[PDB]
Enzyme design. Structure first.
Site, PDB file in Angstrom:
ATOM      1  N   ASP A 164      38.454  90.330 -24.500  1.00 41.62           N
ATOM      2  CA  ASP A 164      39.734  91.081 -24.693  1.00 41.62           C
ATOM      3  C   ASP A 164      40.375  91.366 -23.333  1.00 41.62           C
ATOM      4  O   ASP A 164      41.512  90.951 -23.159  1.00 41.62           O
ATOM      5  CB  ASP A 164      39.625  92.317 -25.599  1.00 41.62           C
ATOM      6  N   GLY A 183      28.218 106.505 -29.940  1.00 40.06           N
ATOM      7  CA  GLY A 183      27.470 105.758 -28.914  1.00 40.06           C
ATOM      8  C   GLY A 183      26.706 104.576 -29.489  1.00 40.06           C
ATOM      9  O   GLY A 183      25.811 104.067 -28.806  1.00 40.06           O
ATOM     10  N   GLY A 220      28.045 101.624 -30.644  1.00 45.05           N
ATOM     11  CA  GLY A 220      28.701 100.318 -30.423  1.00 45.05           C
ATOM     12  C   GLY A 220      29.590  99.875 -31.570  1.00 45.05           C
ATOM     13  O   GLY A 220      29.958  98.687 -31.573  1.00 45.05           O
ATOM     14  N   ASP A 271      39.362  97.327 -29.665  1.00 40.75           N
ATOM     15  CA  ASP A 271      38.796  98.372 -30.550  1.00 40.75           C
ATOM     16  C   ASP A 271      39.930  99.240 -31.156  1.00 40.75           C
ATOM     17  O   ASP A 271      39.862  99.544 -32.364  1.00 40.75           O
ATOM     18  CB  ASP A 271      37.785  99.238 -29.805  1.00 40.75           C
TER      19      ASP A 271
HETATM   20  N1  LIG Z   1      33.954 112.261 -34.121  1.00 39.62           N
HETATM   21  C1  LIG Z   1      33.720 112.518 -32.840  1.00 39.62           C
HETATM   22  N2  LIG Z   1      33.590 113.807 -32.431  1.00 39.62           N
HETATM   23  C2  LIG Z   1      33.340 114.028 -31.129  1.00 39.62           C
HETATM   24  N3  LIG Z   1      33.224 113.156 -30.128  1.00 39.62           N
HETATM   25  C3  LIG Z   1      33.387 111.889 -30.558  1.00 39.62           C
HETATM   26  C4  LIG Z   1      33.625 111.507 -31.862  1.00 39.62           C
HETATM   27  N4  LIG Z   1      33.744 110.130 -31.950  1.00 39.62           N
HETATM   28  C5  LIG Z   1      33.622 109.714 -30.713  1.00 39.62           C
HETATM   29  N5  LIG Z   1      33.353 110.721 -29.823  1.00 39.62           N
HETATM   30  C6  LIG Z   1      33.187 110.567 -28.379  1.00 39.62           C
HETATM   31  O1  LIG Z   1      33.037 109.195 -28.056  1.00 39.62           O
HETATM   32  C7  LIG Z   1      31.753 108.989 -27.387  1.00 39.62           C
HETATM   33  C8  LIG Z   1      31.105 107.669 -27.732  1.00 39.62           C
HETATM   34  O2  LIG Z   1      31.962 106.568 -27.355  1.00 39.62           O
HETATM   35  P1  LIG Z   1      31.311 105.302 -26.571  1.00 39.62           P
HETATM   36  O3  LIG Z   1      30.266 105.852 -25.674  1.00 39.62           O
HETATM   37  O4  LIG Z   1      32.446 104.462 -26.053  1.00 39.62           O
HETATM   38  O5  LIG Z   1      30.592 104.540 -27.794  1.00 39.62           O
HETATM   39  P2  LIG Z   1      31.117 103.837 -29.156  1.00 39.62           P
HETATM   40  O6  LIG Z   1      32.646 103.847 -29.086  1.00 39.62           O
HETATM   41  O7  LIG Z   1      30.566 102.394 -29.205  1.00 39.62           O
HETATM   42  O8  LIG Z   1      30.563 104.743 -30.297  1.00 39.62           O
HETATM   43  C9  LIG Z   1      30.922 110.193 -27.822  1.00 39.62           C
HETATM   44  O9  LIG Z   1      29.857 110.400 -26.918  1.00 39.62           O
HETATM   45  C10 LIG Z   1      31.972 111.305 -27.819  1.00 39.62           C
HETATM   46  O10 LIG Z   1      32.195 111.821 -26.526  1.00 39.62           O
HETATM   47  O1  LIG Z   2      33.931  92.657 -26.210  1.00 38.85           O
HETATM   48  C1  LIG Z   2      33.278  93.706 -25.518  1.00 38.85           C
HETATM   49  C2  LIG Z   2      33.935  95.087 -25.918  1.00 38.85           C
HETATM   50  O2  LIG Z   2      33.294  96.122 -25.377  1.00 38.85           O
HETATM   51  C3  LIG Z   2      33.657  97.345 -25.574  1.00 38.85           C
HETATM   52  O3  LIG Z   2      33.564  97.716 -26.995  1.00 38.85           O
HETATM   53  C4  LIG Z   2      35.177  97.584 -25.323  1.00 38.85           C
HETATM   54  O4  LIG Z   2      35.452  98.827 -25.887  1.00 38.85           O
HETATM   55  C5  LIG Z   2      36.165  96.505 -25.915  1.00 38.85           C
HETATM   56  O5  LIG Z   2      37.331  96.552 -25.318  1.00 38.85           O
HETATM   57  C6  LIG Z   2      35.453  95.106 -25.591  1.00 38.85           C
HETATM   58  O6  LIG Z   2      35.752  94.716 -24.255  1.00 38.85           O
HETATM   59 MG   LIG Z   3      33.542 102.396 -27.340  1.00 40.60          MG
END
Ligand SMILES: Nc1ncnc2c1ncn2[C@@H]1O[C@H](COP(=O)(O)OP(=O)(O)O)[C@@H](O)[C@H]1O
Ligand SMILES: OC[C@H]1O[C@H](O)[C@H](O)[C@@H](O)[C@H]1O
Ligand SMILES: [Mg+2]
Ligand SMILES: Nc1ncnc2c1ncn2[C@@H]1O[C@H](COP(=O)(O)OP(=O)(O)O)[C@@H](O)[C@H]1O
Ligand SMILES: OC[C@H]1O[C@H](O)[C@H](O)[C@@H](O)[C@H]1O
Ligand SMILES: [Mg+2]
Ligand code: NA
Ligand code: NA
Lengths: 391, 391
Positions: free
Chosen positions: B45, B135, B137, B185
């Site tokens: 992306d 967290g 993915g 995303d």
């Molecule tokens: N419903 C929610 N309430 C509170 N925080 C949230 C919520 N959804 C997402 N988050 C935030 O987003 C973070 C996780 O995002 P990230 O680490 O990018 O992982 P992913 O997007 O793959 O789940 C959490 O640790 C928190 O800070």
């Molecule tokens: O494809 C790998 C993927 O990794 C993470 O989820 C990022 O949030 C997206 O933008 C993308 O780059």
């Molecule tokens: Mg993410």
């Protein structure tokens, strides 16, 4: 001067007022579904072809409330519907399905209720308001069907995809209005996105959003305000003629046929059948090419393919009319227009003109002068599709 | 057993309950935005490539009400979120903008507020609930951002396009969360249609809705329940590494480099940067081939391309880990499985497996039995994008 297109809040305000009057209370639920203009790809949807429409800011708004008595009570504020403007009927049951009758306008709503796939559906009270001109070739019929479908979802959520919703509304139009339409008008009402046209593959039902992100570029819709009496008369004749050419060539649809097979199978079909089918294979190629052009920002070439679409529709498919021909010619005389063509089923309705935004005032001034009757105009941007309005 | 995926009704009812307890009255407004799985097209992306995600039935629901005191008052019910789970702060003004602070979860919301393009924005009270694992993915971050954006639209309507909303949310993630993500995303959380994958061209921001309506076909998601913070570290390293290979090749992005052109230009770049770029350029090609396989129902071809994407992410891009590779090789040994690969960022999170519907129960037993950790499973269908819910 272009016609003022009222925003959702204005139609929603007239819908609330007319409902509060008619039923004695504020309505609980509200939805909108837009009309549409096809930029190119005419008489291809029922041939499993390609179309390139966009949703308009012209729309139908439905407001209403569920009932406990299993009855449907309707009011349309549109002055172009056949009287009465009011109808009631019972929900269909296991004992008795709905049947088409009078007034004809309510057949659209009866059909969408009949085929609605989720249960239990309660009765409801509703008012319909529309800025889509009835019979204008901008799909007031699909707009009404999809507004109805989207209202029914607020009473009883469905389980299926957006394609299935489009096909419910198409089925309503077939069985209840007697109009054997393809899928385009319903599909664009549901699937439209602001600032996008949609390349719709009516074989796969794959959809590509093509950006219309350019303030230099204007879509002008010109309503001929003519509705000649071949409409839901010669349309079913064209569909059946296409289907016979496909079956006589051993193809499931004309999408599976190319101009080279058609030229080689000339002795297997009528002279007229050949000409209809030549339009459809041509038109499918033109709209694939026009989509690519539009993506690359090549308006000159998109305009060219539009004018070839009009010629083909007028001569090979015979669904234009002196009024639409006159509007297309008048528009092509104006410095700054890329192309012009009839849109919709034909025999009347609108033309769609692509041009330089700075040319629009002149374009309109010119066309109206060089037109026998009285044209109305819309400067349209690509609009969103059907949605819930929270009251 | 797959993990139960709560329906929107159950999430609305939890959010209202928490909102009643916290703010002392029923909320006025509600929205939802989904998480996602990427079927193929990883780490392309931000290289202006192609991705093929679908929205999940896992989602974030925001309920709230406008305020008059220009304050923002928030509560999350996610026990994954860093303390405190409730927070109050003033809206930004002329003089003063919001800044990233503590707790970290609130920065996603501060960010969408700071870069929200329309005015005037009132204060608001809101509760967030989520079935997207924090967290894991499956993009709880984009789900939270898009649900916040969609909520802000109810307070103060915007006038831009669907892509501009994704960009606002992407910018918030970049400035407020310190994570320089691409647009995938946010785009899928906005544009997801039930029963469809989204082929996103991250160069043109063109999108195709590709139907997924073979009910004999299923998508199994296996959460490793692992996350190494070699991830928040190595993501931006992979990104700059990609940027310096393109620069070193005189290209605007790796999207402008064909795979055979890159193989012949080995000497222009580091053997590390080379392998990074080979993943990317080859993943972009694999995504177009995967889209085409999907269109003709070749799940074998789709499956093998997922396995090549995985081997490529493991060896060339080095964003897998032992847990993900054990999960994949365990899945591939199950009869009825077409393909399996890590999905999302890497260094943890989930796998996605394309298999026969009737094989899913056997696959969940085999994968768990053959996994050193504790896998959780989701049997997910392609779901809808962001929407308003009428209370
Ligand atoms: N419903 C929610 N309430 C509170 N925080 C949230 C919520 N959804 C997402 N988050 C935030 O987003 C973070 C996780 O995002 P990230 O680490 O990018 O992982 P992913 O997007 O793959 O789940 C959490 O640790 C928190 O800070
Ligand atoms: O494809 C790998 C993927 O990794 C993470 O989820 C990022 O949030 C997206 O933008 C993308 O780059
Ligand atoms: Mg993410
Ligand atoms: N808002 C409306 N209220 C009442 N009837 C409507 C409304 N919109 C459409 N109709 C019905 O649909 C018919 C128009 O459909 P059609 O002849 O296919 O033309 P078009 O869809 O191109 O406007 C009208 O004659 C009327 O019966
Ligand atoms: O392209 C012609 C067009 O005509 C009418 O609008 C029908 O409702 C559509 O399905 C399509 O066939
Ligand atoms: Mg119609
Ligand atoms: Na005139
Ligand atoms: Na285990």
């Amino acid at each position: 001067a272009a016609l003022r297109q009222p925003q959702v809040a204005e139609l929603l305000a007239e819908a609330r007022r007319a409902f509060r009057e008619e039923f004695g209370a504020e309505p609980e639920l509200a939805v909108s579904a837009p009309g549409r203009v096809n930029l190119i790809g005419e008489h291809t949807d029922y041939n499993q072809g390609l179309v390139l429409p966009m949703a308009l800011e012209l729309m139908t708004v439905l407001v209403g409330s569920p009932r406990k008595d299993g009855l449907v009570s309707l009011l349309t504020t549109s002055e172009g519907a056949d009287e009465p403007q009011r109808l009631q009927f019972p929900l269909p049951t296991a004992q008795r399905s709905l049947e088409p009758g009078t007034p004809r306008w309510a057949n659209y709503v009866k059909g969408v209720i009949q085929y609605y796939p989720a249960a239990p559906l309660p009765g409801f009270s509703a008012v319909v308001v529309s800025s889509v001109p009835l019979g204008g070739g901008l799909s007031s019929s699909a707009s009404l069907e999809v507004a109805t479908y989207t209202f029914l979802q607020q009473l009883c959520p469905d389980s299926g995809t957006i394609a299935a919703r489009a096909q419910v509304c198409q089925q309503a139009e077939h069985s209840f209005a007697g109009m054997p339409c393809g899928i385009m008008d319903q599909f664009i009402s549901l699937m439209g996105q602001k600032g996008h046209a949609l390349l719709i593959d009516c074989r796969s039902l794959e959809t590509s959003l093509v950006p219309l992100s350019d303030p230099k570029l204007a879509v002008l819709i010109t309503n001929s305000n003519v509705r000649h009496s071949l409409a839901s008369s010669e349309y079913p004749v064209r569909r059946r003629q296409c289907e016979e050419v496909a079956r006589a060539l051993g193809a499931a649809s004309l999408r599976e046929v190319q101009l080279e097979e058609l030229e080689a199978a000339r002795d297997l079909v009528s002279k007229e059948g050949f000409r209809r089918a030549r339009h459809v294979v041509g038109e499918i190629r033109r709209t694939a090419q026009a989509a690519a052009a539009l993506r690359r920002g090549d308006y000159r070439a998109f305009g060219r393919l539009m004018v070839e679409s009009h010629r083909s529709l007028r001569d090979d498919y015979e669904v234009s009319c002196p009024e639409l021909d006159q509007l297309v010619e008048a528009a092509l005389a104006v410095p700054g227009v890329y192309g012009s063509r009839m849109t919709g089923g034909g025999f009347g309705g609108c033309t769609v003109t692509l041009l330089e935004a700075s040319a629009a005032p002149h374009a309109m001034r010119h066309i109206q002068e060089h037109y026998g009757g009285t044209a109305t105009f819309y400067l349209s941007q690509a609009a969103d599709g059907a949605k819930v309005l929270c009251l």
